[PDB]
Design a protein around this nucleic acid. Structure first.
Length: 118
RNA sequence: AAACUUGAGUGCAGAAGAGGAAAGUGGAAUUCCAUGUGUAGCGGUGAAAUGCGCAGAGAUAUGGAGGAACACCAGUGGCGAA
């Protein structure tokens, strides 16, 4: 009931409303997930870099418990906590081979929602 | 009534163009469906709540369905009577 991997990819989704972190193998398999809402932060605070740092630290701790050593960063969303999440990943002992922002670029398909009037 | 080539067209040699009409091909992305991993949140806001989710949501990986628009080029740029 244990997983042993040495190289992997950490997916970090940071939106202005919340931060979610997970780590997977090189073939995208899920071990554990972390979110600011689960950590305890509610409402606005979930977007703060500190909550992102805590979630990234928890996710990296579980990844290294399963045995991860080298990880590649997969960043999603425009939130401000992406850099804090990456630094927490680095400080957890894992080695960042490279960083890539996989934020989906819609070329021209689909109509975005109405601009807010507030 | 009779001449002219300057206006207006024509011939000859060249130029660019999101001008229009009809078929075909394509990548990104959104939604949905199925399945594997996985746990208690997701989403949202000034802050919240409705709502969705312990029947397994959200995240993640793969495949499928389908509609719609064409990121970069792109520019006091081009084309058209509008």
């Amino acid at each position: 009931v244990k997983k042993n991997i040495e190289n992997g990819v950490a997916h970090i989704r940071s939106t202005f409303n919340n931060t979610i972190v997970t780590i997977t193998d090189e073939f995208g398999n899920a071990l554990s997930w972390s979110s600011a809402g689960a950590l305890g932060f509610k409402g606005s605070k979930k977007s703060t870099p500190f909550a992102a740092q805590m979630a990234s630290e928890t996710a990296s701790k579980s990844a290294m418990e399963h045995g991860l050593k080298t990880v590649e960063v997969t960043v999603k969303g425009p939130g401000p906590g992406r850099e804090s999440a990456i630094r927490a990943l680095q400080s957890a002992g894992l080695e960042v081979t490279a960083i890539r922002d996989v934020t989906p670029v819609p070329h021209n398909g689909c109509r975005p929602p109405k601009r807010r009037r507030v």
